[PDB]
């Protein structure tokens, strides 16, 4: 069911500037948006992507939306900065990671199946296409920075995914 929607598909503004990194991403880092909240229709999820891009570009002065990709409750994938582009989601990992945001607050609630499947499919495409290292490490934001992101319940879910990696003795 999951489609990869382009920047133009969701009416993205141009990035002010694009910095690349080379070679397949050794890290995949999972986030939740927190705000905006879950979006269930493509129209709402495209607006959610423009809201995050506008917050990051216009209020924070960033080059672009900080995430590599967004996932909606429509079960669609939204291109953010995309593969091999330096992110603004996970300081120290921005130049060697795919930053994937599941739109919504997943502290307590588990994302619906179509969002989890969409995230797993995006990762599989990336490995398939050589954008994600075949030995990639899957992390939650909270493993590399003091944060609740990507929410306790979503963190418990990705802990069950293949390539989920412990990077510290905790
Ligand atoms: Zn995060």
Numbering used by the authors: 12 to 181
Paper text:
Drosophila PGRP-LB belongs to the amidase PGRPs and downregulates the immune deficiency (IMD) pathway by cleaving meso-2,6-diaminopimelic (meso-DAP or DAP)-type PGN. The structure of the PGRP domain comprises three α-helices and one central β-sheet composed of six β-strands, similar to the bacteriophage T7 lysozyme, a zinc-dependent amidase. The main difference between amidase and non-catalytic PGRPs is the presence of Zn2+ in only amidase PGRPs, which is coordinated by two histidines and one cysteine. We generated mutants to characterize the amidase reaction mechanism and solved the X-ray structures of wild-type Drosophila PGRP-LBPA/PC and its mutants in apo form or complexed to TCT.
Structural analysis of Drosophila PGRP-LB and T7 Lysozyme, along with a multiple sequence alignment of PGRPs from different organisms, reveal the highly conserved residues of Drosophila PGRP-LBPA/PC histidine 42 (H42), histidine 152 (H152), tyrosine 78 (Y78) and cysteine 160 (C160) in coordination with Zn2+ in the catalytic site. In both structures, the Zn2+ is coordinated by H42, H152 and C160. In solution, one should expect that a water molecule would interact with both the residue Y78 and Zn2+ like in the T7 Lysozyme structure (Y46 and Zn2+). Additionally, the presence or absence of Zn2+ was assessed by X-ray emission fluorescence on PGRP-LBPA/PC wild type, Y78F and C160S crystals. We showed that Zn2+ is totally absent in PGRP-LBPA/PC_C160S mutant as already observed in the structure resolution, while it is still present in PGRP-LBPA/PC_Y78A mutant and PGRP-LBPA/PC wild type. Noticeably, no Zn2+ was added to the buffer during purification and crystallization steps, meaning that the Zn2+ present in the active site of PGRP-LBPA/PC_Y78A and PGRP-LBPA/PC proteins comes from the expression cell system. Of note, in the wild-type PGRP-LBPA/PC and PGRP-LBPD even without any Zn2+ in the media, the activity remains the same confirming the strong chelation of Zn2+ by the protein.
